[PDB]
Amino acid sequence: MDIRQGPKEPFRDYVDRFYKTLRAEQASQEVKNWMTETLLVQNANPDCKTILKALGPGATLEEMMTACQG
Amino acid sequence: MDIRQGPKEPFRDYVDRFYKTLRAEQASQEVKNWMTETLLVQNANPDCKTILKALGPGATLEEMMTACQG
């Protein structure tokens, strides 16, 4: 997964790039969930990454987007 | 991904359980690589997890299995 959030890139824009790469692999729902819990958080920028980790397990993409909106 | 390595479970056995769950989603090669770099390492037991992180990026499943063999 080459996609990494730019330090000034809006979270939603990063999410779209991330999912564009995810779609190319026709990932199932379970795979999407795993990728959202791991790589989406791990590849987020310094500011957003801290916030996302502080959400705990089971946080939805929506809750992540709400947390890092801007 | 419910699969987590037991504190006394051989790494290879954990790998097989992990991949059994991965097969159920018909994950592509790219998805397998992402899962191997993230969840396989993150869900490994205390002993093996440290060793695996110390391998750095691009470490193959084979190198991981060699590192935590026993």
Swiss-Prot record, chains A, B:
Q: Where in the cell is it found?
A: Virion
Residues of the region (Dimerization/Multimerization of capsid protein p24) are 2-70
**Which residue spans traverse the membrane?**
none
Q: Which domain of life is it from?
A: Viruses
Post-translational modification (record): Phosphorylated possibly by host MAPK1; this phosphorylation is necessary for Pin1-mediated virion uncoating.
Quaternary structure (record): Homodimer; the homodimer further multimerizes as homohexamers or homopentamers. Interacts with human PPIA/CYPA; This interaction stabilizes the capsid. Interacts with human NUP153. Interacts with host PDZD8; this interaction stabilizes the capsid. Interacts with monkey TRIM5; this interaction destabilizes the capsid.
Q: What does this protein do?
A: Forms the conical core that encapsulates the genomic RNA-nucleocapsid complex in the virion. Most core are conical, with only 7% tubular. The core is constituted by capsid protein hexamer subunits. The core is disassembled soon after virion entry. Host restriction factors such as TRIM5-alpha or TRIMCyp bind retroviral capsids and cause premature capsid disassembly, leading to blocks in reverse transcription. Capsid restriction by TRIM5 is one of the factors which restricts HIV-1 to the human species. Host PIN1 apparently facilitates the virion uncoating.
| Stated name of the protein | Capsid protein p24
List the gene name: gag-pol
Give the fragment's position in the full-length protein.
284 to 352 of 1435
